[PDB]
Amino acid sequence: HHHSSGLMDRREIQRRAKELEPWVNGFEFEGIRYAEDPADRARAFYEAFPGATRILELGALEGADTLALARQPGTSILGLEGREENLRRAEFVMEVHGATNVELRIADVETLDFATLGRFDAVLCAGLLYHVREPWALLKDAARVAGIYLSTHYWGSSDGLETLDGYSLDRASLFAALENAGFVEIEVLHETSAEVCDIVVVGRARLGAQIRRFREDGFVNAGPVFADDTIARLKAGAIDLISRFTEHGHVSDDYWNYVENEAPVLYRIHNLEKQDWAERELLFRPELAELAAAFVGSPVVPTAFALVLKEPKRAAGVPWHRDRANVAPHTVCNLSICLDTAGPENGCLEGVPGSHLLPDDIDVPEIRDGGPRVPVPSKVGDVIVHDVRLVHGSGPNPSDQWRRTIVIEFANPA
Ligand code: NI
């Protein structure tokens, strides 16, 4: 009757499950109760954060929620646990279900330097905020690593919960802790009583909302990234390149130019990383690939470099188009380091929101004239991120100002 298998054998699953006793929530697997709704909350979690490929769970006892979040493909999970018993139980659960895309670490979140972990797309704080003696600092530490699925409790109001370090948690001190942490975009999904109450909120800080709009609209002004110096060096090198055709007498296949009397107008420097640059190293700065990584996916590689130029007065517009249409949405993005201030009357970016989520075969003039054609204002230093499927264009620059921009294409190696 024996000497056979199981549909790891269920006998061995029973042995190692009984070996790690006691279990706090038990352990079931394929129907059988071995020891005495995470998938639902996980689907809600990905409904709140759709493009998450680098999630970080906090307080992953037994890995119940961890396994749930690891179901979605292309996902990498780091789960931190305080007690090593629960850690070995969770490691066991991952071993059984075959979740090879999960790392479980033993770490106390109360005395942990959160900068060591890195940057994460989303953070799951499921039922532990009411275990720390100062939860606001926990939320702040969460903000340093762009979105949180918080599921916690709160206390009515009437009874005075003193006033400790600026916070009374009640509801006011909760939303004030999330606000002071950095999460400016808060959405309550589920929630009251005179004493113990429950609440489940979603939080997006700066860069997080930028991800939301980049996914919905297809383009975002993600502000600056560099800490002084290198941007002005990029501008100086760029003007150093424009002076080759203008001030000197340069000519090559990468100086794209186009009637009578007036000199040919230069509008694009193709293959910018390959040209004679003293500052092309700045094209490989980690902040750029890190930003494009935060918007697209974690492993990003720069695929194309270019320098688009709007000369003063003479510069004409660029027709509306999609850069590439043979890729899935939210897969390849363009970053645009704006070396000059750009306004609607200066030849700045214009996009049709949501056009990146349209089919492959389209008629560009219909999408263009249909609209809306919304402009993307930018200051010198801002970085514009947009999807390659986005239908985008601009008008001409008839004013005295230049309008120079560095465009770099970041894509997933797949
Ligand atoms: Ni384009």
Can you read off the two tokens belonging to residue 225? 């990234």
Of residues 121, 22, 124, the one with CA closest to residue 68: 124
Method: X-ray
3-class secondary-structure state, position 57 = strand
Cα 232 to ligand 1 centre (Å):
24
User: Rounded to whole angstroms, how far apart are CA atoms 353 and 261?
Assistant: 40
Of residues 116, 135, 43, 111, the one with CA closest to residue 78: 116
**First vs last Cα of the chain: how many Å apart?**
48
Asked whether 75 and 55 are in contact (CB, 8 A), the reply is yes
Distance of CA 405 to the CA centre of its chain: 23
Can you read off the two tokens belonging to residue 273? 């990383």
User: Rounded to whole angstroms, how far apart are CA atoms 56 and 60?
Assistant: 10
User: Rounded to whole angstroms, how far apart are CA atoms 108 and 97?
Assistant: 26
Of residues 337, 373, 342, 343, the one with CA closest to residue 355: 373
Neighbours of 95 (CB within 10 A): 13
Cα 349 to ligand 1 centre (Å):
9
3-class secondary-structure state, position 196 = strand
Cα 346 to ligand 1 centre (Å):
17
- In angstroms, the Cα distances linking 335 to 280, 288, 382, 384, 413 are 16, 8, 10, 6, 17
Give the full edge-to-edge strand order of the sheet including 318-321. Answer: 318-321, 392-394, 349-351, 374-376
* Length of the chain as a residue count: 414
User: Rounded to whole angstroms, how far apart are CA atoms 374 and 348?
Assistant: 10
Cα 404 to ligand 1 centre (Å):
14
3-class secondary-structure state, position 248 = coil
- In angstroms, the Cα distances linking 86 to 23, 78, 91, 152, 402 are 8, 15, 9, 21, 61
Q: Which residues face 330 on adjacent strands? A: none
- In angstroms, the Cα distances linking 334 to 67, 288, 301, 366 are 34, 11, 12, 23
254 annotated binding-site participant: no
3-class secondary-structure state, position 343 = coil
User: Rounded to whole angstroms, how far apart are CA atoms 367 and 353?
Assistant: 10
Cα 169 to ligand 1 centre (Å):
50
Burial of 65 (0-12, 13-18, 19+ CB in 10 A): buried
**226-263 CB burial, b ≥16 within 10 A, e <16:** beeebbeebbebbeebbebbeeeeeeeeebbeeeeeee
271 annotated binding-site participant: no
259 annotated binding-site participant: no
Of residues 315, 307, 320, 302, the one with CA closest to residue 368: 320
User: Rounded to whole angstroms, how far apart are CA atoms 372 and 368?
Assistant: 8
88 annotated binding-site participant: no
Asked whether 63 and 87 are in contact (CB, 8 A), the reply is no
User: Rounded to whole angstroms, how far apart are CA atoms 347 and 273?
Assistant: 24
User: Rounded to whole angstroms, how far apart are CA atoms 42 and 65?
Assistant: 7
Question: Looking at residue 263, what DSSP letter applies?
Answer: P
Largest CA distance in the chain: 96
Cα 36 to ligand 1 centre (Å):
59
Cα 96 to ligand 1 centre (Å):
48
Cα 301 to ligand 1 centre (Å):
19
Asked whether 296 and 375 are in contact (CB, 8 A), the reply is no
Asked whether 204 and 212 are in contact (CB, 8 A), the reply is yes
Asked whether 375 and 344 are in contact (CB, 8 A), the reply is yes
Cα 150 to ligand 1 centre (Å):
39
User: Rounded to whole angstroms, how far apart are CA atoms 180 and 119?
Assistant: 19
108 annotated binding-site participant: yes
Quick one: resolution in A? 3.3
Can you read off the two tokens belonging to residue 383? 């970085």
Cα 307 to ligand 1 centre (Å):
12
Burial of 333 (0-12, 13-18, 19+ CB in 10 A): buried
Q: Which residue's structure tokens are 């789960």?
A: 79
Can you read off the two tokens belonging to residue 293? 């990584």
Alpha helices in 153-285, H assignment, sequence order: 171-181, 208-216, 230-245
Asked whether 207 and 294 are in contact (CB, 8 A), the reply is yes
- In angstroms, the Cα distances linking 172 to 128, 155, 164 are 19, 10, 14
3-class secondary-structure state, position 318 = strand
Of residues 67, 210, 78, 81, the one with CA closest to residue 145: 78
Cα 351 to ligand 1 centre (Å):
10
Q: Where are the domains of the chain?
A: 1-206, 207-414
Neighbours of 284 (CB within 10 A): 12
Asked whether 296 and 331 are in contact (CB, 8 A), the reply is yes
Can you read off the two tokens belonging to residue 42? 């996980």
Q: Superfamily for 207-414? A: q2cbj1_9rhob like domain (2.60.120.620)
3-class secondary-structure state, position 279 = coil
Asked whether 44 and 189 are in contact (CB, 8 A), the reply is yes
User: Rounded to whole angstroms, how far apart are CA atoms 28 and 26?
Assistant: 7
